[PDB]
Structure 1
Amino acid sequence: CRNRCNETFSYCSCDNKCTERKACCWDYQDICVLPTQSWSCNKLRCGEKRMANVLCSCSEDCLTKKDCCTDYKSICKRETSWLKDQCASSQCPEGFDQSPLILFSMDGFRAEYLETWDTLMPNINKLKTCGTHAKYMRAVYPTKTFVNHYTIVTGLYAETHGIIDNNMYDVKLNQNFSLSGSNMRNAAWWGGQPIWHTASYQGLKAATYFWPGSEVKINGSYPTIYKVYNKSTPFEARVMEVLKWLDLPKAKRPDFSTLYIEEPDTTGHKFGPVSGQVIKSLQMADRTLGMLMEGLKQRNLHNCVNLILLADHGMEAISCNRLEYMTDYFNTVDFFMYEGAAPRIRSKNVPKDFYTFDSEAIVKKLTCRKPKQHFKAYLAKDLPKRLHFANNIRIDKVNLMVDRQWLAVRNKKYKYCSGGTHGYDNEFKSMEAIFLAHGPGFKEKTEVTSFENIEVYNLMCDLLKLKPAPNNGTHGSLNHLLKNPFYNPSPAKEQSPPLYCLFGPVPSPDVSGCKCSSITDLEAVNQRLNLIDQAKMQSEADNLPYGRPHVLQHSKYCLLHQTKYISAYSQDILMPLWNSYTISKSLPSASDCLRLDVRIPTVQSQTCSNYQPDLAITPGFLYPPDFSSSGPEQYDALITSNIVPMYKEFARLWNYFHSTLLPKYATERNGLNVISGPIFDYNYDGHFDPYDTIDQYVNNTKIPIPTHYFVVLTSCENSTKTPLNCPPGSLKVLSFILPHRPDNSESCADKSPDNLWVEERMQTHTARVRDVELLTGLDFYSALKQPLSETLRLKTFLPIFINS
Structure 2
Amino acid sequence: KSCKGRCFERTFSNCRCDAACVSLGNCCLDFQETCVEPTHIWTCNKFRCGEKRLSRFVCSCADDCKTHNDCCINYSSVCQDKKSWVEETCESIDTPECPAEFESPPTLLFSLDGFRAEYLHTWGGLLPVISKLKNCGTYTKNMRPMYPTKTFPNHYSIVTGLYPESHGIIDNKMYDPKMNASFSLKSKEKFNPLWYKGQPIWVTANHQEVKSGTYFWPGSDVEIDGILPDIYKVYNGSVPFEERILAVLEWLQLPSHERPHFYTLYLEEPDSSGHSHGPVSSEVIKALQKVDRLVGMLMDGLKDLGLDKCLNLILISDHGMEQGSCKKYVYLNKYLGDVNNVKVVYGPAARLRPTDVPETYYSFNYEALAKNLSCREPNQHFRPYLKPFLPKRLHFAKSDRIEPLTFYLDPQWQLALNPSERKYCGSGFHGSDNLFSNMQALFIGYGPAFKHGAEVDSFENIEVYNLMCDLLGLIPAPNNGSHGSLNHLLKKPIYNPSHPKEEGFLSQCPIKSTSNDLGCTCDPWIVPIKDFEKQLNLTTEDVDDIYHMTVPYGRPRILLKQHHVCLLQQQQFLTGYSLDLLMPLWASYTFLRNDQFSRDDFSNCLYQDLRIPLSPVHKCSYYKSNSKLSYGFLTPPRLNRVSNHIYSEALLTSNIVPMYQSFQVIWHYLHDTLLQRYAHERNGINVVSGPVFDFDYDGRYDSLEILKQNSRVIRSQEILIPTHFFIVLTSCKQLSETPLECSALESSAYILPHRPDNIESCTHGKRESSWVEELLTLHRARVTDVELITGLSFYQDRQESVSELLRLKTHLPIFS
TM over 0.5: yes
Q: Does 1:292 align with 2:298?
A: yes
Distance 1:105 1:30, change over 3 A: farther
Identity %: 51
**AA at the equivalent of 1:362:** L
Q: Tell me what 1:606 maps to.
A: 618
Distance 1:680 1:532, change over 3 A: closer
Q: Tell me what 1:151 maps to.
A: 157
Distance 1:318 1:523, change over 3 A: same
Matches for 1:716-727 after TM superposition, within 5 Å: 716-727=732-743
Task: Note the C-alpha offset of 1:71.
Answer: 11
The correspondence for 1:109, drawn from 92, 95, 115, is 115
> Over residues 41-88 of structure 1, what are the superposed CA-to-partner deviations in whole Å (9 max), with x where a residue is unaligned?
984598xxxxxxx999xxxxxxxxxxxxx9998799643321111001
SS in 2 for 1:496: coil
Matches for 1:580-595 after TM superposition, within 5 Å: 580-587=588-595, 588-592=599-603, 593-595=605-607
**AA at the equivalent of 1:115:** H
Q: Does 1:688 align with 2:690?
A: no
2:687/2:730 contact within 8 Å kept: yes
1:45/1:76 contact within 8 Å kept: no
Q: Does 1:569 align with 2:577?
A: yes
Q: Tell me what 2:811 maps to.
A: 797
Alpha-carbon separation, structure 2, partners of 1:457 and 1:329: 43
> Over residues 407-464 of structure 1, what are the superposed CA-to-partner deviations in whole Å (9 max), with x where a residue is unaligned?
1111133452112110000000010001101001111010111000010000000111
The correspondence for 1:652, drawn from 658, 665, 680, is 665
Alpha-carbon separation, structure 2, partners of 1:736 and 1:719: 22
**Cα RMSD for the two superposed structures:** 2.5
Q: Does 1:504 align with 2:520?
A: no
Q: Does 1:176 align with 2:182?
A: yes
Q: Does 1:464 align with 2:466?
A: no
> Over residues 285-330 of structure 1, what are the superposed CA-to-partner deviations in whole Å (9 max), with x where a residue is unaligned?
1011001111111111111100000100000000112111112211
Alpha-carbon separation, structure 2, partners of 1:91 and 1:464: 17
Structure 1: where are the runs of 5+ without partners? 1-26, 32-39, 47-53, 57-69
Task: Note the C-alpha offset of 1:200.
Answer: 1.0
Structure 2: where are the runs of 5+ without partners? 1-48, 54-59
Q: Does 1:379 align with 2:391?
A: no
Distance 1:521 1:269, change over 3 A: closer
Alpha-carbon separation, structure 2, partners of 1:556 and 1:106: 50
Q: Tell me what 1:547 maps to.
A: 554
SS in 2 for 1:112: helix
**AA at the equivalent of 1:397:** P
1:137/1:433 contact within 8 Å kept: yes
Task: Note the C-alpha offset of 1:632.
Answer: 5.9
Matches for 1:278-289 after TM superposition, within 5 Å: 278-289=284-295
Q: Does 1:474 align with 2:485?
A: no
SS in 1 for 2:748: strand
**AA at the equivalent of 2:198:** G
Matches for 1:382-781 after TM superposition, within 5 Å: 382-413=389-420, 414-504=422-512, 506-507=514-515, 510-516=516-522, 518=524, 523-531=530-538, 535=542, 537-553=544-560, 554-587=562-595, 588-592=599-603, 593-603=605-615, 606-626=618-638, 629=641, 633-694=646-707, 695-697=710-712, 699=714, 700-727=716-743, 730-749=744-763, 753-781=767-795
Distance 1:357 1:628, change over 3 A: farther
SS in 2 for 1:321: helix
The correspondence for 1:277, drawn from 273, 283, 300, is 283
Alpha-carbon separation, structure 1, partners of 2:453 and 2:593: 39
Alpha-carbon separation, structure 2, partners of 1:440 and 1:604: 64
Alpha-carbon separation, structure 1, partners of 2:76 and 2:245: 17
Alpha-carbon separation, structure 2, partners of 1:532 and 1:363: 49
Alpha-carbon separation, structure 2, partners of 1:373 and 1:107: 31
TM-score, structure 1 normalization: 0.89
Alpha-carbon separation, structure 2, partners of 1:533 and 1:566: 8
Matches for 1:62-461 after TM superposition, within 5 Å: 78-89=81-92, 90-334=96-340, 335-413=342-420, 414-461=422-469
Distance 1:124 1:642, change over 3 A: same
Task: Note the C-alpha offset of 1:29.
Answer: 14
Task: Note the C-alpha offset of 1:250.
Answer: 1.3
Distance 1:646 1:533, change over 3 A: closer
Distance 1:42 1:341, change over 3 A: farther
Distance 1:457 1:71, change over 3 A: farther
**AA at the equivalent of 1:783:** D
Task: Note the C-alpha offset of 1:558.
Answer: 0.3
2:52/2:62 contact within 8 Å kept: no
Q: Which moved more, 1:569-578 or 1:697-706?
A: 697-706
**AA at the equivalent of 2:685:** L
Q: Which moved more, 1:101-110 or 1:515-524?
A: 515-524
**AA at the equivalent of 2:494:** F
2:724/2:751 contact within 8 Å kept: yes
SS in 2 for 1:589: coil
